[PDB]
């Protein structure tokens, strides 16, 4: 029963009965704006130095940055249900998903080829229910939500293109560099360097 330090705490744990402002590890009240990304550790493994490799990638992106990714696996003896093409019905399912996904972009590309043969028609005038998320006593008037009727504007057939498109800017940065995973630099000799 004397906190007063980080020493008297043997292996941490602030006693909530002292009624002081003690704190076991350095959970400072005025932690400044630090731009370091958090040094995060996996379930029981090492410090994730993979986090400095995935700057602009997502969380499900699979990249290889460890030495365990360089060692060969075993012979994987025979007709094992591990190394199998997944399922013929799953193949048909992925085939159907992919053909439906590609035919839509095909139709959107092909719509340019004949612009107006049977010139366009539009009336799916619809409703959307919108919750403004910045609630005020007087702001909507008096309600949590508001309903908006959207009509697509009717396009003039006798109307040329509106804006310049030929403008061009240089190619942006590519995705974050992948680590190389190379072998250890086979040694070069002076004699072969001269030959």
């Amino acid at each position: 029963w004397i906190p007063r330090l980080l020493e008297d705490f043997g292996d941490g744990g602030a006693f909530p009965e002292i009624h002081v402002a003690q704190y076991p590890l350095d959970m400072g009240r005025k932690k400044k704006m630090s731009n370091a990304l958090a040094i995060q550790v996996d379930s029981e493994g090492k410090i994730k130095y993979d986090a400095i490799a995935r700057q602009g990638q997502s969380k499900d992106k699979v990249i290889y940055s460890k030495y365990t990714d360089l060692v060969p696996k075993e012979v994987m003896n025979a007709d094992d249900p591990d190394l199998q093409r997944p399922d013929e019905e799953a193949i048909k399912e992925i085939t159907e998903k992919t053909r439906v996904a590609l035919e839509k972009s095909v139709s959107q590309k092909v719509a340019a080829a004949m612009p107006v043969r049977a010139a366009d028609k539009l009336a799916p005038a619809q409703y959307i229910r919108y919750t403004p998320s910045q609630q005020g006593v007087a702001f909507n008037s008096g309600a949590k939500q508001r309903v908006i009727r959207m009509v697509e504007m009717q396009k003039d057939p006798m109307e040329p293109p509106r804006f310049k498109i030929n403008k061009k800017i240089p190619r942006g940065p590519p995705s974050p560099p992948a680590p190389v995973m190379h072998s250890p630099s086979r040694k070069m000799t002076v004699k072969e360097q001269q030959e």
């Binding site: 409703y127 229910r129 919750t131 998320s133 008096g142 949590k144 939500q145």
Partner: protein, 158 residues
């Protein structure tokens, strides 16, 4: 008490106990009014409604004519109904809409009529102007001079 909080689109038919139990624990303090509200894209939650056209435009024109309307919220404070607007005129005029025969009928405006189409340069069927309100609106006696002053101050710039 059985299901994930939000992933979406459950493949099995859920129970009321297994989907609408509240989340346990305290809220995190690291969110604002915009971040704590279940918003959809930067300014709130937008979902496709399917309201009847006539009833929508009825309440819309009722607000635009008077200043009150019913609440199109899904639940809100749970309750069968309430009105949203200038609430005092809703219970005053018993909550009528524009598409219904009105309670008030007084003080109609007066306009010309020459509905015969026989007298040339005298006919005005539905183009009849009001007898009281009149065309070109010259402003005032001092409004003119102060507008001349403000245009002169504009002239001292260019």
């Amino acid at each position: 008490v059985h299901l994930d909080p939000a992933v979406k689109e459950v493949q099995y038919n859920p129970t009321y106990e297994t989907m609408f139990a509240p989340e346990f624990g305290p809220e995190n303090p690291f969110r604002t009014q915009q971040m704590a509200a279940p918003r959809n894209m930067l300014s709130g939650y937008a979902e496709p409604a399917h309201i009847n056209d006539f009833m929508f435009e009825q309440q819309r024109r009722t607000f635009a004519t008077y200043g009150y309307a019913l609440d199109p919220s899904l639940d809100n404070h749970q309750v069968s109904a309430k009105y949203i607007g200038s609430v005092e005129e809703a219970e005053k005029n018993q909550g009528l809409t524009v598409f219904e025969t009105g309670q008030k009928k007084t003080e109609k405006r007066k306009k010309f009529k020459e509905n015969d189409a026989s007298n040339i340069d005298g006919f005005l069927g539905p183009w009849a102007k009001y007898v009281d309100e009149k065309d070109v609106a010259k402003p005032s006696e001092e409004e003119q001079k102060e507008l001349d002053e403000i245009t002169a101050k504009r002239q001292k710039k260019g």
